[PDB]
Design a protein around this ligand. Structure first.
Ligand SMILES: CCCCCCCCCCCCCCCCCC(=O)OC[C@H](COP(=O)([O-])OCC[N+](C)(C)C)OC(=O)CCCCCCCCCCCCCCCCC
Ligand SMILES: CCCCCCCCCCCCCCCCCC(=O)OC[C@H](COP(=O)(O)OCCN)OC(=O)CCCCCCCCCCCCCCCCC
Ligand SMILES: CCCCCCCCCCCCCCCCCC(=O)OC[C@H](COP(=O)(O)OCCN)OC(=O)CCCCCCCCCCCCCCCCC
Ligand SMILES: CCCCCCCCCCCCCCCCCC(=O)OC[C@H](COP(=O)(O)OCCN)OC(=O)CCCCCCCCCCCCCCCCC
Ligand SMILES: CCCCCCCCCCCCO[C@@H]1O[C@H](CO)[C@@H](O[C@H]2O[C@H](CO)[C@@H](O)[C@H](O)[C@H]2O)[C@H](O)[C@H]1O
Ligand SMILES: CCCCCCCCCCCCO[C@@H]1O[C@H](CO)[C@@H](O[C@H]2O[C@H](CO)[C@@H](O)[C@H](O)[C@H]2O)[C@H](O)[C@H]1O
Ligand SMILES: CCCCCCCCCCCCO[C@@H]1O[C@H](CO)[C@@H](O[C@H]2O[C@H](CO)[C@@H](O)[C@H](O)[C@H]2O)[C@H](O)[C@H]1O
Ligand SMILES: CCCCCCCCCCCCO[C@@H]1O[C@H](CO)[C@@H](O[C@H]2O[C@H](CO)[C@@H](O)[C@H](O)[C@H]2O)[C@H](O)[C@H]1O
Ligand SMILES: CCCCCCCCCCCCO[C@@H]1O[C@H](CO)[C@@H](O[C@H]2O[C@H](CO)[C@@H](O)[C@H](O)[C@H]2O)[C@H](O)[C@H]1O
Lengths: 100, 73, 81, 670, 494, 72, 61, 48, 64
């Protein structure tokens, strides 16, 4: 794919976007978990931004029959719109969800 | 302070502006002033606050499409 | 009949009946800077207008002569056989 | 080129406004007029570019607002609907500029006037060329700021300052609802770009489309002067005549119509708004046709005629035939501008008198003006084969063409509204040119007859026509008013025309009524408006010329006295707005200021705590008389109270009651 | 030393030089006024240096200094995107605030310059401190200089005006102190890094909310508690009015991003309908009574109450857009309210000695430069597009509608009512007829001083309106940290 | 018959000249000068915004899908 | 004119390759981890002192 | 510092941006019980 | 029943005519004569009709 930029190594998270198994009194590990979650939520919203830019070019390209040519892009944008918001880490940091 | 330009200060407007400034010194508690005060300070905020509580989290429009309902609750 | 007005009042738009005797020279100079400014926005347009459909070769479309996307297309299409 | 159409009117405005001293009246007029002439030529080319070739043009410059899910750019889209609007906007703006050189020649402040003209053209371009609803709102507000600046051009006149408050604030009411409507779009879809909103429109919650459509429609009343929020449009006749020709009757008033036409790929999926659009349209046509027939100001009549035509387009939008509403919009800005520039020409000739009761003859004195306004009045009534014939008469037969109760209703309502249009068109053309002279001899005293001996050199002033910069616009707009409808009937009416097949005007196959309007509608209803115009015109001419007593009988009857004053006073809508809405808000402000802020908030607060505590502290301070005998008694008293409290195991609350009792006893004097 | 401590020492160094120059020359007051102005410009150059180096996507506080020595009370300075623009606003205003009031003081000029140079340090500190007791320390250290600024250089009703501001701000801020002391008792420190990790029990949060909101409601201020501002701003000197509206009214706005959004989230969520009910009421009442105000400078002060309510509902939206719009509307209010105060308190009062709108009419005829700027600042007060005020209101209003729709619908009525009073004031002073007859002699138009501070303030309002990304790119990542909530498929990742 | 242009800018009558009050020096050189120097510096400020970082990752995720074309 | 000139000069180029000034500006404000290392030390100490303040203030009488 | 998810959902409740994993399925059950209508959003793609 | 003033609206409307004798008769006679006679006012109410009618007949005769 597109090469990973030099600016995209300095700010790339080194930790998974989670708080499970993170000692809070280790401030270094804690702030990086905060950063990891915020960066993921933001990649998700810019993923929808880019799909929306493609939708627009399919709209101005297909004109009248965009209703039968731009449906795949419409799916992806509507999926992302329901799932990506920047909600922060504060709720995530302060609650644990067992997933069981 | 600095000298200002000459203004034909109207004695009538000057005493009116003085009246507006000292007016509070003459407010009394009547049956009328209480009725207006109770309406504005209690009733309207309590009505706005009550609707704010009843409809709070009631609706969401994001990504809602046909076949879905606007009502969250 | 012209309105009497105060002559100490300075206005950027001239005031009451303001025409300088250098009006033509100043108007000429403002015309060039307008022409120069509108020349930069034109070259921006040419390189940044986006079309998803190119015009026909014989069909009247004067944009063909300055917009880069069309000029890239028509030059590429002028290579065949 | 495309981004240069946007930039030129802005630059001429800046030179005329901030640099008027350097260029002068002549230089400001030249730069302002030339920049909009050049823009007009570049826009006629863009019509061939975009529309005739089906090549939409997209250009984004930089981002305006950047957030989560919100990315609104300084971007512009040129499609078939954009170039369609640009032609009347820029042809009329160019001609009103050329016109205004003659009309505003004697005014002191020409640089400021011509600067506001170019500022309005720039804002109107921004409104129709934007990629998204939020940049279209910049032009919407911008046109509002420019209409306030031009209604209040003569700031010395108080009437003008009241009328500009009306224009500004009645349009802010519409802006509140568009802002709510754009919030709904961002809340539902995440972005308010046109491609986004229209691509996703078929799938959005049907009730979410109700909320957006109602908010878009309410905002559309204020600018399109529909009956609910229309009081401002006739008051905007305070500004100079060329302002009323472009802004108040040929461009800004149409923005509300453009908002619905642009939002066609969305509001088509809500038939609930389409009924409201349709009935909104039919009401305004009869509401304003009736009012204009009882007005005595020429500008007020031509302002109420415009709102009758704006009601026609909103009717067509709710009829779901957007190409018909766009056709009427472009055709109307040619003959409504003509009648206003022609009326402005007779106001100029007759010493700035605007009352029909003081105009008469003048047909021989202003031959070009009369014929040109006869050109305009025949297309205003949609006389066969005029420009307005193909636009207004297709709205009527399309209303009956939708074989529904609401359609047949609006056909009857609109046909009646057309009857009154023919009545006030005769009134204007008869009382200004064809009736006996009703004004002073000064307008009619020539030099062919000698009224003087030692002053023959001057002092006749007999209502002459203006100069080249005045007549030239009138001739051009006359040619449009005769032929433009025929030459463009296919681009807009057509039968399966593909001019708007880039989804600029989306009609849903469910709402198509074109084929029935071509074949189903009977010839009687198709021809019915024509007979009414020809029959009423002759009836009103006889009642105005041959039998003039009968109308005097009507207005001198108590029944007709009330009916004449009811429609002259504009349905009393102004009366009930000042008395129950405007004055109610000013009373509410006074009651909050007088009784709450300066009243109970200071009494149950700092001032009541001040006067209460100072009274209390003087009483306690009066217990201290510097008598050792009385101080000794106090120590014993305070000793016993401590002994009672810590030996009777009294509830601590019993103590606090004592303190509050004691403190409030020192609160009472004597 | 750090670069955030240089921000504080320079205004202190300027105080020293004004105090000692007479000991080297009987010195002119013009020399005292150049020292104070050069000192404020240097603070603005440092603050622009800080902004060049600042990392727009960093979750660690920047330009900090390793203390390594702990006492009971210790100054800890740091900068985050949430605070950088508040610092910049303080450093752009203070130079103009001095220039605006350059001729109007006349007596006690050293004292006047020393108080402003001292205020600049105290208001800069309140944004730079990384503890909540240190925040309170500077959020309330400004009350003694402001009591004496109004009393020494204020208008006729100055004594009562200065008593109102001090006593209301003292009373309201002592309920904040009780809440701060409780959090310190439960956690052991008020340093932000340690406090933001900690999660309080709901009941503790609901009582910490009652006490931070009481403080903020008095200092916003809300409608029934705004009497101090109607007195303070009007009777204050022009320079004090500029500081109190642009910078001091923003201390409560920036204090919600520290004291409420990150540490009391459940309380903020379950009590937002109380906040929105108050915020809605203060949008309507303030606006109705701004229409009937007859003192021009008090018409500018009342306008501030309506705007603060829009940004208060924006900070309580739990939305990224309403939170950034709240900061944008506070920055926008800082420029526009400064200009309208300069017009009312510094141009009309300078030439007439009156603030009554009865005496002003047709001022555009003799003062065409004043009317041009006055119109632009009135349009921004009305939230017209192309000004930063429109962007902040739109985002503040959208997050209000997304949180609890009904209250944002009432709050949206500010579009009709802010417009109503702004144009009505304008048409009555600039327009409204011919030049008044109460003016015996002609008034001069704008001076090169009056023109260039009005032009500077208008320039910031318009340029930032066109490209708000100058401020928006810095707040995005840091605003992301104060949102409370989860999404069902984006959270708890494995 | 247009009149000559008129007026006194800054209230300076046609006889004399503008007298520098004192503020002008620092405000034109220091206040405004700092903003132009800040403006030219801001052009070379590296872009550390979250979006420039999030766009590039987002493109690399959508490139892994048919949504965005990859140059490889 | 200056804005057009300054903007033209300060652009990066065809594909990456920042200019010398861009290199200088990014170099001076590097701070690769020195904000993190100093914040972590300070957070660790102020967290210790909170434990200490609780130990000394909640001791058995 | 952290608490059970159930503990917080008791004081604030799901909704108002607090969409815990499983919010949509529960909302369907909640909406079906109160409104008597099954939620079934439309596809938005003519293909699949 | 009649008012103290001699005003009756039925009689008022009866006199809404052109009076037989008028003291101002000659002062107003210019508005109904010359350019302002019935014919002159409507002589050119349809400006181009006369030129167009004969011109259109010339085009209409195209059979020959
Ligand atoms: C760009 C056009 C700028 C025009 C400025 C005209 C001017 O200098 O007026 C001075 C004029 C005076 O120019 P003047 O030449 O008529 O002066 C003659 C003498 N007196 C002073 C008596 C009039 O003063 C005004 O009337 C000022 C009123 C405010 C004008 C505001 C114009 C800009 C509005 C921007 C709208 C933005 C909307 C965004 C959405
Ligand atoms: C009535 C309006 C009159 C306007 C007069 C002033 C016109 C200014 C024209 C500026 C043209 C900038 C051209 C930039 C091309 C795009 C390159 C780029 O990325 O620049 C970054 C920034 C944002 O632009 P971008 O992210 O690309 O937004 C998407 C739409 N293209 O783009 C920028 O560099 C913009 C930063 C400054 C914007 C202007 C702010 C002051 C005005
Ligand atoms: C002063 C105070 C901001 C203003 C308010 C927001 C805009 C309006 C919001 C209310 C309407 C939207 C929610 C309606 C919910 C609902 O279930 O209504 C359904 C109904 C239409 O149902 P149906 O015909 O089945 O839908 C189309 C199917 N093909 O929908 C209806 O029939 C709705 C009823 C008609 C509404 C017309 C407009 C009313 C305006 C009231 C004043 C607003 C100010
Ligand atoms: C007399 C006083 C007039 C005051 C008002 C003036 C308004 C226009 C001001 C001039 C606009 C261009 C000059 C802007 C200076 C800043 C330069 C800049 O940021 O880029 C401007 C851009 C030129 O960039 P360019 O060289 O074309 O880059 C690609 C080259 N391959 O060029 C452009 O981006 C052109 C687009 C500008 C915006 C056009 C209108 C869009 C918004 C409406
Ligand atoms: C943009 C700012 C404003 C946005 C927020 C306001 C949105 C208003 C949404 C109103 C509709 C909400 O969702 C609506 O609720 C009503 C009940 O009230 C219900 O309406 C239902 O009524 C009957 C029962 O009486 C059902 O058989 C029918 O299927 C449906 O119409 C549905 O659940 C839904 O149509
Ligand atoms: C929430 C409720 C309120 C919270 C707390 C706010 C309390 C504010 C109370 C301030 C009361 C006013 O305080 C008092 O005002 C009067 C003016 O009337 C001042 O009195 C002064 O002004 C008068 C004005 O005529 C002059 O004669 C003279 O300068 C002096 O006597 C007092 O020096 C001051 O102490
Ligand atoms: C939005 C409202 C916010 C309010 C916040 C809290 C404000 C302070 C609350 C207490 C205010 C003091 O309230 C005030 O106390 C004194 C008591 O001597 C009274 O003051 C007055 O009492 C009577 C009037 O009834 C007078 O004859 C007397 O001269 C005077 O002392 C007022 O009756 C009361 O209004
Ligand atoms: C915590 C307490 C509250 C702190 C609030 C901040 C207060 C700041 C006050 C500034 C310091 C005092 O300011 C001081 O004013 C006196 C006025 O008598 C000046 O003293 C001099 O003033 C003028 C100068 O021409 C002389 O006419 C006068 O005779 C002389 O006393 C000092 O030169 C100045 O330094
Ligand atoms: C206006 C004046 C309003 C009253 C003053 C504020 C009262 C606040 O006092 C409040 O009282 C309740 C009663 O237990 C306590 O609140 C909390 O206490 C402990 C926590 O340590 C919990 O076990 C208890 O369940 C909880 O209610 C706190 O002490 C305090 O939050």
């Amino acid at each position: 794919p597109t090469p990973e930029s030099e600016a995209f190594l300095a700010k790339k998270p080194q930790v998974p976007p989670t708080f499970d198994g993170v000692d809070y009194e280790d401030n270094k590990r804690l702030k990086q978990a905060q950063d990891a979650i915020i960066r993921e939520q933001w990649v998700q919203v810019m993923m929808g931004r880019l799909v929306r830019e493609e939708l627009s070019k399919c709209y101005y390209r297909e004109g009248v029959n965009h209703l039968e040519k731009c449906g795949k892009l419409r799916e992806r944008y509507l999926q992302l719109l329901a799932n990506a918001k920047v909600k922060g880490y504060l709720f995530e940091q302060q609650n644990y969800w067992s997933k069981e | 302070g600095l000298q200002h330009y000459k203004i034909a200060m109207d004695p009538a407007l000057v005493r009116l502006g003085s009246m507006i400034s000292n007016r509070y010194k003459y407010f009394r508690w009547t049956k009328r002033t209480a009725l207006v005060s109770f309406m504005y300070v209690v009733v309207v905020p309590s009505t706005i606050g009550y609707l704010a509580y009843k409809t709070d989290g009631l609706w969401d429009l994001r990504a809602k499409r046909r076949g879905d309902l606007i009502s969250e609750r | 009949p012209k309105i009497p007005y105060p002559k100490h009042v300075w206005s950027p738009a001239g005031g009451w009946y303001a025409q300088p005797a250098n009006w033509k020279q100043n108007t000429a100079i403002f015309g060039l800077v307008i022409f120069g400014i509108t020349a930069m926005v034109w070259k921006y347009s040419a390189e940044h207008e986006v079309r998803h459909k190119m015009p026909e070769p014989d069909r009247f479309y004067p944009s063909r002569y300055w917009v880069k996307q069309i000029k890239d297309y028509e030059r590429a299409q002028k290579e065949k056989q | 080129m495309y981004l240069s159409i946007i930039i030129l009117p802005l630059l001429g405005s800046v030179v005329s406004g901030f640099f008027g001293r350097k260029v002068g009246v002549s230089g400001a007029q030249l730069i302002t007029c030339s920049s909009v002439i050049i823009t007009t030529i570049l826009s006629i080319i863009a019509f061939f570019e975009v529309g005739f070739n089906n090549i939409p043009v997209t250009i984004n410059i930089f981002r305006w607002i950047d957030s989560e899910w919100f990315i609104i750019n300084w971007g512009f889209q040129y499609d078939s609907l954009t170039v369609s609007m640009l032609i009347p906007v820029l042809i009329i703006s160019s001609l009103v500029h050329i016109y205004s050189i003659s009309y505003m020649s004697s005014d002191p402040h020409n640089q400021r006037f011509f600067s506001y003209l170019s500022l309005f053209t720039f804002m109107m371009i921004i409104l129709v060329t934007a990629n998204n609803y939020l940049l279209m709102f910049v032009g919407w507000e911008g046109v509002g700021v420019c209409s306030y600046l031009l209604v209040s051009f003569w700031f010395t006149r108080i009437a003008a300052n009241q009328s500009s408050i009306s224009a500004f604030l009645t349009n802010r009411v519409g802006d509140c609802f568009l802002t709510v409507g754009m919030f709904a779009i961002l809340w539902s879809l995440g972005n308010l770009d046109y491609a986004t909103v229209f691509s996703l429109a078929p799938y959005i919650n049907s009730n979410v489309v109700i909320i957006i459509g109602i908010c878009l429609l309410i905002g559309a009343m204020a600018k399109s002067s529909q009956v609910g929020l229309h009081v401002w449009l006739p008051m905007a006749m305070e500004g100079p005549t060329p302002v009323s020709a472009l802004i108040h009757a040929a461009t800004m008033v149409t923005a509300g119509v453009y908002l619905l036409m642009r939002s066609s790929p969305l509001i088509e999926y809500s038939s609930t708004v389409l009924l409201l659009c349709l009935w909104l349209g039919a009401i305004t046509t009869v509401f304003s046709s009736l009012i204009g027939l009882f007005q005595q100001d020429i500008k007020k009549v031509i302002a109420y005629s415009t709102m009758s035509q704006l009601g026609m387009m909103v009717l067509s939008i709710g009829l779901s035939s957007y190409n018909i509403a766009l056709f009427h919009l472009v055709n109307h800005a040619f003959y409504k501008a003509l009648l206003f520039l022609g009326a402005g020409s007779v106001i100029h000739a007759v010493a700035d008198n605007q009352d029909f009761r003081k105009f008469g003859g003048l047909i021989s004195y202003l031959p070009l003006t009369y014929s040109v306004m006869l050109i305009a009045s025949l297309s205003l009534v949609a006389f066969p084969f005029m420009t307005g014939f193909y636009s207004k008469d297709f709205i009527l037969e399309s209303a009956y063409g939708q074989f529904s109760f609401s359609g047949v209703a609006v056909y009857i309502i609109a046909t009646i509204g057309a009857i009154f249009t023919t009545l006030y068109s005769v009134k204007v053309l008869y009382l200004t040119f064809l009736s006996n002279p009703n004004g002073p001899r000064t307008y009619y005293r020539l030099a062919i007859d000698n009224f003087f001996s030692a002053q023959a050199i001057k002092s006749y002033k007999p209502a002459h026509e203006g100069d080249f910069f005045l007549t030239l616009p009138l001739v051009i707009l006359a040619l449009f008013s005769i032929f433009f409808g025929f030459i463009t009937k296919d681009i807009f009416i057509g039968l399966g025309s593909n001019f708007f097949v880039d989804n600029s005007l989306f009609i849903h196959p469910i709402h198509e009524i074109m084929i029935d309007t071509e074949f189903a509608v009977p010839v009687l209803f198709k021809l019915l408006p024509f007979i009414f115009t020809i029959s009423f015109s002759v009836i009103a001419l006889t009642l105005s010329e041959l039998l003039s007593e009968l109308v005097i009988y009507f207005k001198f009857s108590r029944f007709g006295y009330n009916i004449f004053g009811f429609f002259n006073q504009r349905f009393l809508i102004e009366f009930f707005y000042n008395k129950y809405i405007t004055n109610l808000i000013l009373n509410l402000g006074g009651q909050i200021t007088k009784i709450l802020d300066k009243g109970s908030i200071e009494l149950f607060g700092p001032y009541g705590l001040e006067r209460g505590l100072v009274k209390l502290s003087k009483n306690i301070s009066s217990l201290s008389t510097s008598h050792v005998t009385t101080y000794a008694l106090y120590i014993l008293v305070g000793f016993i109270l401590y002994l009672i409290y810590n030996n009777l195991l009294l509830d601590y609350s019993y103590l606090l009651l004592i303190i509050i009792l004691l403190l409030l006893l020192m609160m009472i004097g004597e | 030393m750090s670069l955030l401590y240089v921000l504080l020492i320079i205004p202190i160094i300027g105080i020293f030089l004004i105090s000692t120059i007479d000991s080297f020359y009987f010195f002119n007051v013009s020399y005292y006024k150049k020292i104070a102005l050069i000192t404020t410009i240097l603070n603005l150059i440092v603050s622009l240096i800080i902004y060049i180096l600042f990392d727009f996507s960093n979750n660690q506080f920047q330009f900090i200094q390793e203390n390594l020595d702990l006492s009971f009370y210790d100054i800890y300075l740091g900068v985050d995107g949430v605070s950088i623009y508040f610092v910049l606003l303080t450093t752009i205003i203070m130079p103009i605030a001095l220039v605006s009031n350059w001729n109007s003081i006349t007596n006690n000029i050293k004292s006047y310059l020393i108080i402003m140079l001292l205020l600049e340090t105290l208001l800069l500190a309140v944004f730079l401190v990384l503890d909540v007791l240190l925040f309170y320390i500077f959020f309330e250290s400004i009350l003694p200089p402001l009591f004496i600024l109004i009393g020494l250089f204020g208008s006729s009703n100055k004594v009562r005006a200065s008593f109102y501001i001090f006593l209301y701000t003292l009373l309201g801020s002592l309920f904040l102190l009780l809440s701060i002391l409780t959090m310190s008792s439960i956690v052991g420190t008020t340093y932000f890094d340690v406090l933001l990790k900690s999660s309080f029990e709901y009941t503790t949060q609901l009582f910490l909310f009652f006490g931070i909101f009481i403080a903020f409601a008095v200092k916003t201020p809300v409608w029934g508690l705004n009497s101090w501002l109607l007195r303070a701003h009007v009777e204050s000197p022009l320079g004090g009015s500029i500081v109190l509206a642009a910078i001091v009214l923003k201390l409560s706005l920036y204090g919600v991003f520290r004291l409420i959004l990150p540490i009391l989230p459940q309380a903020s969520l379950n009590l937002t309908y109380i906040v929105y009910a108050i915020g809605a009421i203060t949008v309507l009442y303030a606006s109705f009574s701004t229409l009937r105000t007859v003192d021009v400078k008090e018409l500018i002060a009342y306008s501030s109450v309506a705007h603060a309510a829009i940004y208060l509902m924006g900070v309580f939206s739990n939305t990224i857009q309403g939170l950034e719009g709240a900061i944008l509307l506070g920055l926008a209010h800082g420029f526009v309210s400064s200009g309208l105060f300069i017009c009312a308190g510094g141009i009309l009062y300078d030439r007439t000695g009156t603030r009554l709108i009865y005496f002003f009419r047709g001022l555009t005829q003799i003062m065409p430069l004043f009317s041009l700027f006055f119109f632009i600042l009135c349009l921004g007060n009305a939230g017209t597009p192309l000004t930063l005020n429109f962007v902040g209101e739109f985002m503040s209003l959208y997050g209000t509608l997304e949180r609890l729709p009904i209250a944002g619908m009432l709050a949206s009525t500010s579009i009709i009512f802010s417009a109503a009073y702004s144009i009505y004031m304008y048409n009555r002073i600039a327009f409204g007829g011919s030049v008044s007859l109460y003016f015996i002699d002609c008034f001069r138009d704008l001076t090169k001083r009056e023109f260039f501070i009005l032009f500077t303030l208008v320039s910031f309002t318009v340029i930032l309106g066109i490209y708000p990304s100058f401020v928006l790119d810095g707040l995005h990542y840091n605003i992301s940290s104060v949102v409370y909530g989860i999404e069902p498929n984006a959270s708890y990742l494995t | 018959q247009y009149d000559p242009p008129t007026g006194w800018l800054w209230g300076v009558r046609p006889g004399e000249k503008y007298q520098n009050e004192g503020w002008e020096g620092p405000f034109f050189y220091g206040f405004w000068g700092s903003l132009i120097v800040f403006a030219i510096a801001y052009a070379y400020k590296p872009d550390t915004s979250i979006q420039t970082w999030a766009l590039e990752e987002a493109r690399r995720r959508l490139e892994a899908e048919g949504i965005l074309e990859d140059p490889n | 004119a200056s804005s057009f000139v300054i903007y033209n000069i300060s652009r990066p180029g065809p594909n990456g390759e920042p200019s010398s000034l861009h290199k200088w500006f990014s170099k001076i404000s590097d701070y690769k981890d020195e904000w993190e290392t100093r914040n972590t030390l300070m957070a660790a100490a102020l967290e210790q002192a909170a434990h200490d303040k609780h130990l000394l203030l909640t001791a058995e009488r | 510092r952290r608490r059970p998810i159930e503990e917080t959902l008791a004081e604030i409740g799901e909704g108002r941006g607090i969409k815990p994993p499983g919010y949509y399925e529960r909302r369907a059950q909640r909406l079906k019980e109160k409104y008597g209508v099954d939620i079934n959003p439309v596809c938005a793609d003519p293909d699949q | 029943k009649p008012n103290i003033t001699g005003f009756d609206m039925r009689e008022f409307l009866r006199h809404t005519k052109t009076p037989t004798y008028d003291p101002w008769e000659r002062h107003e006679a210019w508005r109904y004569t010359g350019r302002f006679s019935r014919f002159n006012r409507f002589k050119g109410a349809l400006p181009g009709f006369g030129i167009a009618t004969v011109a259109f007949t010339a085009y209409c005769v195209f059979e020959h």
